[model samples]
Target: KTHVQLSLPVLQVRDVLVRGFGDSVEEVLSEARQHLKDGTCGLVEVEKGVLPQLEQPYVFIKRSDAAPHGHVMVELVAELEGIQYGRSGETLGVLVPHVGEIPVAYRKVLLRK
Candidate 1:
């Protein structure tokens, strides 16, 4: 006879949020985006400030001179400062850590109003 095991394929990290610009998360991403474009140390510093709260995450950003602009992609790896977040709703949570140097796209913005 053969023995097999089955388990949940996904993790549930709650009360998470994305880190970037702003004193609060509300403006982190926006500020981060500008930093990404300008490649400023200040912006990178702010983004790094909120990395403590992130959990096991997998996401990557890309910046190819070939493309018209830059792009972002979530991945399945782990990093030192990955962001974490709940799967639903935008009320409370920290996003997984950013994996790579790929620039996040405008469409990827979680807050747009």
Candidate 2:
């Protein structure tokens, strides 16, 4: 017997995203730029003590305009220290314990000016 796990896209659309970040900044930046269309995904670095404020794994958050997937509105966000959050379009990851950083795909709000 087995358990539930995963899909088919038919158009060769893989459900898995490519590795854009993995504890390295240089490689991540380069790959993340190229990986934006498939959906921006990567990791970030901040102070270690701020871990207490992550609030429910921060689903939708604004990483930036280039983020392609982060949000900067609705204001329904979680803030602390210097980290910010947005929507689900692109992603920005962060290191969390042994669990590692999670690449969240939050989209940017359509209000660019």
Candidate 3:
């Protein structure tokens, strides 16, 4: 028999910060989408009370083209708060407790319209 313990869902996006380049935001996101196709990328589950920060170069996808057009380089800036659940893994069951921030250098490369 297998015994399992489940943590309650308590995570919410307190705030979302998106940074990218111009005219090609879609293109870059499209590229980021392709990046995940390699199979190395996995979904990181965010838990409540814990803030999430990307530990690697994470891809940010937008369903609508509401962001300013530009190329955005993504990176895990710094871990603001620690996660109470899991870490980056191959499945959604594992959650990551970290924070990621984009650097100014990455934003500098954005293409302007």
lDDT score at residue 74, model 3, on the 0-100 scale: 26
TM-score of 1: 0.24
lDDT of prediction 2 = 0.28
* Cα deviation of 79, candidate 2, in Å: 21
lDDT tens digits by residue: candidate 2, 28-95: 33333333324333223223543333333332222333422333321112323345433333332332
Per-candidate total of colliding backbone pairs: 21, 19, 20
**Candidate 2 structure, TM-score to reference:** 0.25
Number of the candidate with higher TM-score, 1 or 2: 2
Give residue 48's lDDT in candidate 2 (0 to 100): 56
Residue lDDT tens for model 1, 84-113: 321222121233323233432222222211
Q: Evaluated with TM-score, which candidate comes out highest? A: 2
Clashes of 1: 21
lDDT of 3: 0.26
The Cα RMSD of model 2 versus the native structure comes to 13.9
Model 3 lDDT tens row, 42-64 = 22334553223433222332112
For residue 96, model 2's alpha carbon misses the true position, in angstroms, by 12
